[PDB]
Design a protein around this ligand. Structure first.
Ligand SMILES: O=C(O)CCC(=O)C(=O)O
Ligand SMILES: O=C(O)CCC(=O)C(=O)O
Ligand SMILES: [K+]
Ligand SMILES: [K+]
Ligand SMILES: [K+]
Ligand SMILES: [K+]
Ligand SMILES: [K+]
Ligand SMILES: [K+]
Ligand SMILES: [K+]
Ligand SMILES: [K+]
Ligand SMILES: [K+]
Ligand SMILES: [K+]
Ligand SMILES: [K+]
Ligand SMILES: [K+]
Lengths: 193, 193
């Protein structure tokens, strides 16, 4: 269970690359406080296509644990700097035209029961190219990340100053053309298994 | 000569792509005010290598006008939304290890003679991958863009509120490993030819 009692960030990667065990991840841009990092080459095109197909074959939502998800969760754990036992698992979302996710927080309300082991960081991976729309936007920061296949946006909200955590308000913009496929890894403060 | 007398941005591209005449440019992220846009697939790897070689063959600095520079300046003009006659031309810079560009503004001081036709926007294109360091950082915004071959960072400073223009303070971080090659297009308020 993480402890921020003496302002630091969980993500501690320096430089322009993250050399994971099976892939070299690109660091594209950083908004430092609260920490929002745009990452390139997080997933290959083949991995993006298969997470989409796995979500479709299960629909006929969190994915079931095979060898692809475990491989990606280990690579994600190197990126987010938290062991994979904190991750809720790969959650796959699909936005058709005219669908969106309005602005919200990822950490749970303090009075909620899920806040006992609350989330601390999020990684959103873009599994396909969106013809128009579907950007990840942060209203209080006037910042948006646009979907691009293989890329991802990282942001954390484990600050002592709650003002910094409240700036991580974000949503998914309406898809106007095409469709949007994303994979999301939420990281809990403690072991989630 | 541009006129902002009735707050709008010169860059007006919507969506996730910029369909220029010879290339589809990716919109990666946007910091909206002041407008800073991270762009992908701005230059091919072959174009990046040749602008570097052209700078080296001229050293033995602004490049001379051939067909490659005119082709890129036309593509850049579609991105920056200003005719190429406003551009100063492709300026190539090389940072070795232990070299940097400290924080500064791109528009000239108001009492300077170059401020008669002052700059309004800048595009910085990364011509190679930097092993470590060399990020384009904006201190007053706590934002940095890291170098990635083929990508570019766009930002403009033609706002009526001078507070917004003064937030475009930026520099090139010290290169600690490898080297950094960039192409820069500065756009003047009026025709520069
Ligand atoms: O659609 C987006 O870009 C944001 C996705 C998101 O908010 C999430 O899955 O946690
Ligand atoms: O080195 C950088 O990333 C910034 C380049 C720059 O400031 C310029 O060429 O105008
Ligand atoms: K594909
Ligand atoms: K869900
Ligand atoms: K309650
Ligand atoms: K506060
Ligand atoms: K379509
Ligand atoms: K569909
Ligand atoms: K090359
Ligand atoms: K110069
Ligand atoms: K003067
Ligand atoms: K002001
Ligand atoms: K080296
Ligand atoms: K060199």
């Amino acid at each position: 269970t993480n402890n921020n009692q003496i302002e630091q960030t969980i993500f501690d990667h320096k430089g322009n690359v993250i050399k994971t065990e099976d892939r070299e991840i690109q660091i594209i841009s950083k908004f430092e406080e609260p920490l929002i990092v745009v990452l390139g080459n997080v997933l290959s095109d083949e991995e993006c296509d298969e997470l989409i197909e796995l979500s479709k074959s299960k629909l006929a939502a969190f994915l079931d644990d095979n060898e692809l998800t475990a491989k990606i969760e280990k690579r994600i754990s190197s990126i987010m700097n938290v062991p994979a036992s904190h991750g809720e698992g790969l959650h796959i979302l699909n936005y058709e035209v005219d669908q969106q996710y309005k602005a919200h927080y990822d950490y749970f309300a303090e009075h909620s029961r899920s806040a006992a082991n609350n989330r601390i960081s999020t990684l959103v991976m873009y599994l396909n190219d969106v013809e128009e729309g579907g950007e990840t936007f942060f209203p209080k920061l006037n910042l948006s990340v646009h979907p691009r296949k293989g890329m991802a946006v990282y942001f954390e909200y484990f600050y002592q100053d709650q003002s910094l955590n409240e700036l991580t308000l974000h949503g998914g913009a309406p898809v106007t053309k095409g469709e949007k496929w994303i994979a999301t890894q939420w990281v809990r403060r403690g072991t989630y298994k």
